Design a protein around this ligand. Sequence first.
Ligand code: MQT
Ligand code: CL
Length: 138
Amino acid sequence: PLIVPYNLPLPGGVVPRMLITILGTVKPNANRIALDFQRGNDVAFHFNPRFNENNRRVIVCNTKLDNNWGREERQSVFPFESGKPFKIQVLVEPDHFKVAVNDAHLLQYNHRVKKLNEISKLGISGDIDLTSASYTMI
Ligand SMILES: CO[C@@H]1O[C@H](CO)[C@H](O)[C@H](OC(=O)c2ccc(C)cc2)[C@@H]1OC(C)=O
Ligand SMILES: [Cl-]
């Protein structure tokens, strides 16, 4: 039982082979989830499941630099369901973040922010009960 929004420090930034695991349950009638990998005020990787965008479910991925959002990448495969427990795993690879949900590959996001050692915080927010947030090296 962790408080949301939750800030997970990533000491010395991210590195390839770092695996971040988030466990939680989506609230009933959820609207959004967001994981935000931050480099200071910039958001290196915004992973944003939206439960009702024009009556569609979509995952939006983006980067925020100097307070400006970039070109969105959208994924229509949507493994989350209101009321149900999930596992999100984010594996940092040399050229992209790799995301799996409930042990199935979901998407990859090419690194736009290239100073990986400066991506030193993960913010977790949205309509979830958060059970665990941790990292390890594989
Ligand atoms: C072009 O709309 C924007 O798209 C962006 C991705 O391209 C972000 O998702 C952004 O949302 C936010 O920054 C945000 C942060 C905190 C909270 C509580 C709500 C939204 C916003 O989306 C929406 C949905 O406004
Ligand atoms: Cl950079």
